[PDB]
Design a protein around this ligand. Structure first.
Ligand SMILES: [Mg+2]
Ligand SMILES: [Mg+2]
Ligand SMILES: [Mg+2]
Ligand SMILES: [Mg+2]
Ligand SMILES: [Mg+2]
Ligand SMILES: [Mg+2]
Ligand SMILES: [Mg+2]
Lengths: 114, 99, 206, 79, 151, 100, 127
RNA sequence: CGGUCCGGCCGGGAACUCAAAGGAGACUGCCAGUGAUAAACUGGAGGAAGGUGGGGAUGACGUCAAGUCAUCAUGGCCCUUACGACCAGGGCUACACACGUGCUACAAUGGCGCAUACAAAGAGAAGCGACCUCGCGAGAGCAAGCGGACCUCAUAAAGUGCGUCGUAGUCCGGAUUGGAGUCUGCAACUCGACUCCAUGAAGUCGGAAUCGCUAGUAAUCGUGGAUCAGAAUGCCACGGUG
């Protein structure tokens, strides 16, 4: 198995195997199998090359993997060069969405040091 | 048709005493009297802080019991309508007339 | 520790409400402020007229104020001279038409609010607090009170360190809900601050 | 962020942007309107946006359109 | 328990075999007040234990329980600043309660696929006396025989 | 509260019934009609020119005697302290200490 | 005439009607099996029909409102016993011994001010 | 019971569930043992309830110059073309850290999908807002009923049935961030709540130490309310299993 973004999906069920791609979650994976006419509870075994390429053509419609990674990074860098509040916070590695910094901001800040 | 009287009061030993007046006045002046029907009491509870500053666990808990009475008078006799209209009821009892 | 209001805890048990009207969530707030505004006017006006209690009921779209007083003659005036001028402005404050009733307070030395206001008016005349308290206790006991307690708090006699002093005679069972305990407050606005007066009068059980 | 039914802009600042187009670019536009959305008719102008004490001058660029004027004026000093 | 001398709450018997001892066991396993899911785990474990040990569902429980049941235990007591462990003979009621409690706790500490499988394999280990639960009775024994002088 | 803070509320009530009760509601319902005017309305702009204090959302519920902006109860129009004081004197009808 | 008995537990209220013949059980126009998905709840209503014999001796038309699974099942158990004493009255001795006549007065305790639950006190901190 | 659109829905029936006013009942009263023949305790009978049956309210004289002059009131002091007053923008939401109280987790007593049984207690006209229609959705348009045991918020969730995952940083866990939106409000940049799509941190059960709880309690599971234009993991209250 090999779909769009170089990655090799495991020999698990169709819906969870497609979530391995960066840019396809639960909703996209369900929509991709519904448009290609493949069952959700079927494994990679029995799924021949004729059924793989029809999913590859279906997943090609949305920006996934490296193509999506640079798209997310470009929007972060856009805010940064802009000089806006949102960009100053991506530059200072602190919570962007307005969250408190007095306490609990450890995901963005990273582990504490004395 | 039928005359529906809905009674509201915060005091129970005042609502059924003013209801006793309506039921007796109507059954004496000759009218078919359904009820007094005791409808559910609406208990509005209030929790207030007892201290002017701080002391969160220290509180006062109050309630306002709104007693409900339903008096249905089937026969709208002129002898009954005029007797009930010129009746002196407790000032703290609200009367709803439904035609 | 802290004691429960003796009047508040006995409401519905042996003590009546000072406001008996009914209102929905709609006009309940507006009626309560109107009640405060009418009580405020009358307490100021009839200050020397020995007012002990004010009862407010609202029959339909009207206001029925019952002034409990130890001096009804000064409240009523010359053949209703003073009742008419009070009713005219109570009707203005409330919005709805006014009716004023005058209830006579027979033995005022047995009325907590009138004992409290008497001690307060005395403290403002520069009377000795112990004398004012002892007289209040003696007068109530000789007139049939089953018990009496009088408290005076803060800067007693003009003292720098404030004290809480009390005189008790007879039975004052504050834990019996069945017990007729008439409790009221008053504040003496002295040249050296505020002196609080708390009076408890036991009149018997049931 | 807001309902698609009309972006927000202060009338006093909107008239100041109109007066700056016809009469030509002047000195920084002194405005306290931090809540106003940047329109395309602002690109090129210098808007002096308040921060609470001073008026931070911001050179309006094409990428700044849609964002609020208060995003380019830091309110809290942290060093 | 300073002045008040209380007894013990008599719980309703097992809905399957009418055993009061099994009702104590289902309650010990029970978590978050989920009795429905607690007896479901106990019955599935007993169904897989009796089948894989030669029937007698009540007797197969008793064989596993006889091995974990302790005879003596230590009681912490501070006489003169020092903490002495006094060995005390455990009552027949608590003898069973400790035996059941250690079975549930040892099955919880297992790495199997389900609690019904964890419980069954813990009862199988206890019947042949070679598990975490029988070692808890063993450690309790070594502690009692050590402080045998302060009895 | 301060006399000025109480006065600020009176102004906020007076302006609320003057505009945002009979005039500003007409231009807000108009700024919501999808069927009529989808670009040229100016109603969102003319709502700004109206006084700020005219909005009912700008009004703060305060104790009707003391002016306290905290611990307010709509049922009595008073703060928890002045609710208790009136309650204990039997000045709040039907209200007593509850237990269940 | 129908032999009646009221039964209740917690916030549940059950009405039990006794008529002789068969071993039928109808709860709120539904079957005993259809209403209760738990066999433990099914056995507690079968309990009064153990000491007092019944296989196909008497029918029962039952209706219950309020509470939950064990609340409703507990309420019916109390109702059957009250409808059984309505039929004989000499059955009291057997019904007392089992403890089915007793109304279980255990209601959920009110949440108290300053407490997280009815008794659960918020976590104490010394410093 | 009479009639069926198989809905208490309509005549009716006042039986029952329930509603809410009044009343009865439990007092160691009876029996037995222990105990100075006492007090009392223990056990048993009857009883729906048994030893203050369960829960609440109720907090003595006093203690800590304990808390509150920022609820209010008030002695004294201080400012009074300013410590007063009006306005816009900002701050109270900052962030190397430390502590206290919480929520959500680390999973198969569990996650997910479909199907489905059973509550209690509240709120509501400048309000709760059905049904219908549009949108994946938050919502939106249209528009009944209801100042309410009638109408509405509102589908209780745990549970049960079947199927799936199979001990994996996972179909566990949801932080963080990107893109697009919804609504309230003059106005959501600082700094609202919620939705859709994508992202998928830490965490595989917590050192020394430490807390709550004795029964319908703990534990767990949902539900409502006050404040409130909008803003609950807090608080107050409610029942389910147990
Ligand atoms: Mg993915
Ligand atoms: Mg002032
Ligand atoms: Mg506000
Ligand atoms: Mg009663
Ligand atoms: Mg007592
Ligand atoms: Mg998940
Ligand atoms: Mg205790």
């Amino acid at each position: 198995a090999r779909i769009a973004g170089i990655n090799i999906p495991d020999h698990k069920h169709a819906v969870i195997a497609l979530t391995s791609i960066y840019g396809v979650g639960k909703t996209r994976s369900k929509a991709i199998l519904a448009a290609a006419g493949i069952a959700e509870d079927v494994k990679i075994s029995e799924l021949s090359e004729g059924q793989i390429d029809t999913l590859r053509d279906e997943v090609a419609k949305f920006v996934v993997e490296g193509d999506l990674r640079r798209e997310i990074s470009m929007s972060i860098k856009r805010l940064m060069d802009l000089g806006c509040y949102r960009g100053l916070r991506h530059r200072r590695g602190l919570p962007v969405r307005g969250q408190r910094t007095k306490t609990n901001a450890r995901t963005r800040k990273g582990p504490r040091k004395p | 048709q039928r005359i529906r009287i809905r009674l509201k009061a915060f005091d129970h030993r005042l609502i059924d005493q003013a209801t006793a007046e309506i039921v007796e006045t109507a059954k004496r002046t000759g009218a078919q009297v359904r009820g007094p029907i005791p409808l559910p009491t609406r208990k509005e509870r209030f929790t207030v802080l007892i201290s002017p500053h701080v002391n969160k666990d220290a509180r006062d808990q109050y309630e306002i019991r709104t007693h409900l009475r339903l008096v249905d008078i089937v026969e709208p006799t002129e002898k009954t309508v005029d007797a009930l209209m010129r009746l002196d009821l407790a000032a703290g009892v609200d009367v709803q007339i439904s035609l | 520790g802290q004691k429960v209001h003796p009047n508040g805890i006995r409401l519905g048990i042996v003590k009546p409400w000072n406001s008996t009207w009914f209102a929905n969530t709609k006009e309940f707030a507006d009626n309560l402020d109107s009640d405060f505004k009418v009580r405020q006017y009358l307490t100021k006006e009839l200050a020397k007229a020995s007012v002990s209690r004010i009862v407010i009921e609202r029959p339909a779209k009207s206001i029925r104020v019952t002034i409990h007083t130890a001096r009804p003659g000064i409240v009523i005036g010359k053949k209703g001279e003073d009742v008419e001028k009070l009713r005219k402005v109570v009707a203005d404050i409330a919005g709805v038409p006014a009716q004023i009733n005058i209830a006579e307070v027979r033995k005022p030395e047995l009325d907590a609010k009138l004992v409290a206001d008497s001690i307060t008016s005395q403290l403002e005349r520069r009377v000795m607090f112990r004398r004012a308290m002892k007289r209040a206790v003696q007068n109530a006991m000789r007139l049939g009170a089953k018990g009496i307690k009088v408290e005076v708090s803060g800067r007693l006699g003009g003292a720098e360190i404030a004290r809480t002093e009390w005189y008790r005679e007879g039975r004052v069972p504050l834990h019996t809900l069945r017990a007729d305990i008439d409790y009221n407050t008053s504040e003496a606005h002295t040249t050296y601050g505020v002196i609080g007066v708390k009076v408890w009068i036991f009149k018997g059980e049931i | 962020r807001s309902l698609k039914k009309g972006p927000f802009i202060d009338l006093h600042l909107l008239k100041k942007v109109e007066k700056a187009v016809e009469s030509g670019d002047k000195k920084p536009l002194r405005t306290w309107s931090r809540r106003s959305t940047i329109f395309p008719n602002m690109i090129g102008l210098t808007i002096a946006v308040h921060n609470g004490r001073q008026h931070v001058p911001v050179f309006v660029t094409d990428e700044m359109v849609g964002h609020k004027l208060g995003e380019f004026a830091p309110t809290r000093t942290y060093r | 328990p300073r002045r008040r001398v209380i007894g013990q709450r008599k719980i309703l018997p097992d809905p399957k075999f009418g055993s009061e001892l099994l009702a104590k066991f289902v309650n010990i396993l029970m978590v978050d007040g989920k009795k429905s899911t607690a007896e479901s785990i106990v019955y599935s474990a007993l169904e897989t234990l009796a089948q894989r040990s030669g029937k007698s569902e009540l007797e197969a429980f008793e064989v596993a329980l006889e091995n974990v049941r302790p005879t003596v235990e230590v009681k912490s007591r501070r006489v003169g600043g020092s903490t002495y462990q006094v060995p005390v003979e455990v009552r027949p009621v608590r003898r069973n309660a400790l035996a059941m409690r250690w079975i549930v706790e040892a099955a919880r500490k297992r790495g199997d696929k389900s609690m019904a499988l964890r419980l069954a394999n813990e009862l199988s280990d206890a019947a042949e006396n070679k598990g975490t639960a029988v070692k808890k009775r063993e450690d309790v024994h070594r502690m009692a025989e050590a402080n045998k002088a302060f009895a | 509260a301060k006399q000025s803070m109480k006065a600020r509320e009176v102004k906020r009530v007076a302006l609320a019934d003057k505009y945002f009760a009979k005039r500003a509601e007409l231009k807000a319902i108009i700024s919501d009609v999808n069927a009529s005017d989808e670009d040229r309305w100016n109603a969102v702009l003319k709502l700004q020119t109206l006084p700020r204090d005219s909005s009912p959302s700008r009004q703060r519920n305060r104790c009707r005697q003391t002016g306290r902006p905290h611990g307010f109860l709509r049922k009595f129009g008073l703060s928890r302290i002045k609710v208790r004081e009136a309650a204990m004197r039997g000045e709040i009808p039907g209200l007593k200490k509850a237990s269940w | 005439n129908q032999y009646y008995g009221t039964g209740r537990r917690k916030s549940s209220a059950a009405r039990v009607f006794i008529k002789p013949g068969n071993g039928k059980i109808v709860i709120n126009q539904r079957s005993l099996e259809q209403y209760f998905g738990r066999e433990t709840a099914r056995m507690v209503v079968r309990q009064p029909l153990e000491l007092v014999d019944m296989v196909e001796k008497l029918d029962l038309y039952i209706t219950v409102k309020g509470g939950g699974i064990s609340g409703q099942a507990g309420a019916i158990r109390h109702g059957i016993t009250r409808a059984l004493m309505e039929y004989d009255e000499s059955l009291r001795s057997e019904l007392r011994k089992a403890g089915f006549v007793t109304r279980d007065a255990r209601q959920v305790e009110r949440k108290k001010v300053g407490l997280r639950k009815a008794r659960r006190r918020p976590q104490f901190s010394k410093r």
